[PDB]
Write a protein that binds this ligand. Structure first.
Ligand code: UO5
Length: 337
């Protein structure tokens, strides 16, 4: 049984020669040599079984990633676990190894306009498929966009994903939320549970802005500071957009703020392609009803060199800790001999 950083890796003998990569609240990640398909692979040790929310997230991802098949969405190649529930303490998810992610890339590299266009194309192409399955990713951010040495992009981390539920999207003002702060749509802080496809388009808009300057566009330091940053650039909402917020606490908060003028995109991004900034504007629309949809974004002039709806496929099949351990056990059975 190989060891890495105070953790066993029961992955062998198929997978050998491990090197550490990263870790989190309930898992660790290594590269490894796969002896059957003769390549290095990524492996994620997940240890969720003590906690119901980690169980929920592990199960969501497995179920989604096994149903999905798309060039721009990370797949699962293998799952390794003990042969019985009783002996199962960890799950290892095997996936294609990717050179880097967009978070690491943006911290070190200037992107050409051609790179930005191609990355945005692939994000939206993957997202078209995700949304066509009635799924919302709900945590799109640069670190969840993996890249290989030829700049092919795959969306990962479906642990916060939900089935879309637009009729049950409304909530009160300043209702707590789980997804990453800098990529949260303004409506999350006002009146939305993040159950609509528009939540994901806002995150893509933020990612686009961050590709243009190598800096997050809305770097809030805490829940309501996030709205502060958004309004600092978009300006005060229009009368019509306020009228769509019927919740009085959310409405009256916005009414309380001094007038702020829109910062023009071409002032924030003086070297950007004008067509990129037109698409940016449409993704970072304050009102989610007016916000561009994935399929319209793909059809936008900025992406004209790539747009091809016949090669932008859709999904064929849209969608306690003790029982969730069993469902994880059931869902991973197909990888056993
Ligand atoms: O598995 C997740 C969420 N993650 C975290 C992650 C890391 C890495 C990869 C990954 N990276 C690479 N190439 C890296 C090389 C070096 O440059 C960076 C990219 N290639 C393939 C994958 Cl598949 C994918 C994921 C992913 O899907 N969760 C459960 C437990 C856990 C475990 C570890 C960290 C956080 C968490 C919480 C959520």
């Amino acid at each position: 049984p190989e060891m890495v950083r105070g953790q066993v890796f029961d992955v062998g003998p198929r997978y050998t020669n491990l090197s550490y990569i990263g870790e989190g609240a309930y898992g660790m990640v290594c590269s490894a040599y796969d002896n059957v398909n003769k390549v290095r692979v990524a492996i994620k040790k997940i240890s969720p079984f003590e906690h119901q929310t980690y169980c929920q997230r592990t199960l969501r991802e497995i179920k989604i990633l096994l149903r999905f098949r798309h060039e721009n969405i990370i797949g699962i190649n293998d799952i390794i676990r003990a042969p019985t529930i009783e002996q199962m303490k960890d799950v290892y998810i095997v996936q294609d190894l990717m050179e880097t992610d967009l978070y690491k890339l943006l911290k070190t590299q200037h992107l050409s306009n051609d790179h930005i266009c191609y990355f945005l194309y692939q994000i939206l192409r993957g997202l078209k498929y995700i949304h066509s399955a009635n799924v919302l990713h709900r945590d799109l951010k640069p670190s969840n966009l993996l890249l290989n040495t030829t700049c092919d992009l795959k969306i990962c981390d479906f642990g916060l994903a939900r089935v879309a539920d637009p009729d049950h999207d409304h909530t009160g003002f300043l209702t707590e939320y789980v997804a990453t702060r800098w990529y949260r749509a303004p409506e999350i802080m006002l009146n939305s549970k993040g159950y609509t496809k528009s939540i994901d388009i806002w995150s893509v808009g933020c990612i686009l802005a961050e590709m243009l300057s190598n800096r997050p566009i809305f770097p809030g330091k805490h829940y309501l500071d996030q709205l502060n940053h958004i309004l600092g650039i978009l300006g005060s909402p229009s009368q019509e957009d306020l009228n769509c917020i019927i919740n009085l606490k959310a409405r009256n908060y916005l009414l309380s703020l001094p007038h702020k003028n829109k910062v023009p995109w071409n002032r924030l991004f003086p070297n950007a392609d004008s067509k990129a900034l037109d698409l940016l504007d449409k993704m970072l629309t304050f009102n989610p009803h007016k916000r561009i949809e994935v399929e319209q974004a793909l059809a936008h002039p900025y992406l004209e060199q790539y747009y091809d709806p016949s090669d932008e496929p859709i999904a064929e099949a849209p969608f306690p800790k003790e029982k969730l351990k069993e469902l994880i056990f059931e869902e991973t059975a197909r990888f056993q001999p």
